Amino acid sequence: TASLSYALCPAGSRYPLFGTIILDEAFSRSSHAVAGRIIAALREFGLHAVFITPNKEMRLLRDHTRSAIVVHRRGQNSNMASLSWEELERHYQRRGNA
């Protein structure tokens, strides 16, 4: 992350011109104590982060991101729906009536 943050900074500038970094399988090998530090370092260097995770560490993502992209499978076709955490909370509350 530090290397990329430097690399994307134009010469003579402190902030990267390209800000997005993708972390696929974000935290498959770390607990909260280390994932939180990963997030802190990732934001400190100035990057805007997009995380991927197969429904793991959901409670941690909820505190450091503001929208989720729920991707689900049906047969051979895949569909994706973008939502805010709070809308998904309302959805879970509707589920809570079951």
Partner 1 sequence: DFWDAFNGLDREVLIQQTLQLLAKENRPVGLAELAELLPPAHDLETFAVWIGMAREAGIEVIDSQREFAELSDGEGRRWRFNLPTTGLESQALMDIDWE
Partner 2 sequence: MNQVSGLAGKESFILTRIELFNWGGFHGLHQAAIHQDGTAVIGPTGSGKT
Ligand X SMILES: Nc1ncnc2c1ncn2[C@@H]1O[C@H](COP(=O)(O)OP(=O)(O)O)[C@@H](O)[C@H]1O
Q: Which does 30 bind (CB under 5 to 8 A by kind): ligand X, ligand BEF, its own copies, none?
A: its own copies
- Report how far apart the first and last C-alpha atoms of the chain are (Å, whole number): 44
Cβ atoms 1, 41 nearer than 8 A = yes
H or E element: which one contains 97? none
| Count of residues that interact with its own copies, criterion CB under 8 A | 10
Q: Token pair of 72, please? A: 């689900």
Nearest approach in angstroms of CB 61 to ligand X is 15
Q: Using CB under 8 A, list all residues that contact partner 2.
A: 14-20, 24, 26, 29-34, 39-40, 43, 46, 48-55, 58, 61, 64-73, 76-80, 82, 84
Residue numbers at the binding site for ligand X (CB under 6 A): 54, 73
* Contact of 67 with 61, CB cutoff 8 Å: no
